[PDB]
Paper text:
Triptorelin is a decapeptide with uncharged N- and C-termini pE1–H2–W3–S4–Y5–(D)W6–L7–R8–P9–G10–NH2 that contains three aromatic side chains (Y5, W3 and W6), and three ionizable residues, R8 and Y5 (pKa>10) and a histidine, H2 (pKa=6.1 in water). All together, these results show that the peptide conformation, the peptide molecular packing and the assembly morphology of the triptorelin self-assemblies depend on the protonation state of the peptide single histidine, H2.
By optimizing the crystallization conditions large single crystals diffracting up to 0.85 Å resolution were obtained. The high-pH crystal structure obtained at 0.85 Å resolution reveals a histidine-serine H-bond and histidine-aromatic interactions, whereas the low-pH molecular structure demonstrates these key interactions have disappeared, likely in favour of cation-π proximities. Hence, the 25-Å-thick bilayer observed in the crystal structure (fully compatible with the 26 Å determined by SAXS) is essentially maintained by aromatic stacking, as shown by the side view of the bilayer and in agreement with the low β-sheet content observed by ATR-FTIR. The histidine tautomer in the crystal and in the nanotubes is the τ tautomer.
Author numbering: 1 to 10
The structure:
């Protein structure tokens, strides 16, 4: 839902 979560799974 947002690119700024990086590599957070999901």
């Amino acid at each position: 839902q947002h690119w700024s979560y990086x590599l957070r799974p999901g």
